[PDB]
Amino acid sequence: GSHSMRYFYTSMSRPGRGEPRFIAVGYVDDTQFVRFDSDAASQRMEPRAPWIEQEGPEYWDRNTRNVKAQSQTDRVDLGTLRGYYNQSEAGSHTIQRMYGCDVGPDGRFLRGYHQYAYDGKDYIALKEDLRSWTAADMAAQTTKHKWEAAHVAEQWRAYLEGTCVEWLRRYLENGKETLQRTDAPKTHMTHHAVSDHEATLRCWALSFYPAEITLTWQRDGEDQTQDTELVETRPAGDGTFQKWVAVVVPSGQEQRYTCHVQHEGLPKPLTLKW
């Protein structure tokens, strides 16, 4: 019922391989709509979903300006943080930056997000209130000082609780016939002998959306994790998602096991048995 908009930035230094690469993606929920790459030919903020193409060239200008600028400042933060932790000119390092907002079915603002990582670790982040910065390490407090007195958190709260939610609602209302759809998972089972006395019962949930889903095995009515394998949710490459869960069971006892599927696009949770 709820919805979310999230932007992800990544910048990687490649000393000797060239000048730092910058990649930026924007998702509404589990649906990407925009992308940008520094190694890209067009070097333009491109569309990735049909329902966002309906924006005047000023959109595609403003966003492009912003992403280019952010790429440059990221280029700065690279050498900056390379100075902080005293890192060689040689080493390759990564800056990741995630931010965005959440809304209910009501469209009401629910929560804001801004986190910043260096080399894959939390470097700094913004709390719920969108007022106070939290720094993970020593050198991060320096940055926090630079942003505490620059009223940066104010700019962030002004953007997130305002413009972000606005454009989120707009995107939702626009793409409604794709963004507010709920593809129910087509489910089925497979069954393969493993030993002379055992078999695998694999429970399949395909072609669903959104990715959020729950698959569980039950022995005679009580859950099992013993002898079970659960794979991470994966994209089909069409906008839908796939997932499965398998359990190794004794031969002839497949009737005792029950697979359970839960997903928003389902009125009532399914129960599959072999």
């Binding site: 924007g26 400042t73 900056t80 630079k146 962030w156």
Partner: peptide, 9 residues
């Protein structure tokens, strides 16, 4: 859209 916030660390 995106943000205009640009500030070094």
């Amino acid at each position: 859209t995106l943000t205009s916030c640009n500030t070094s660390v």
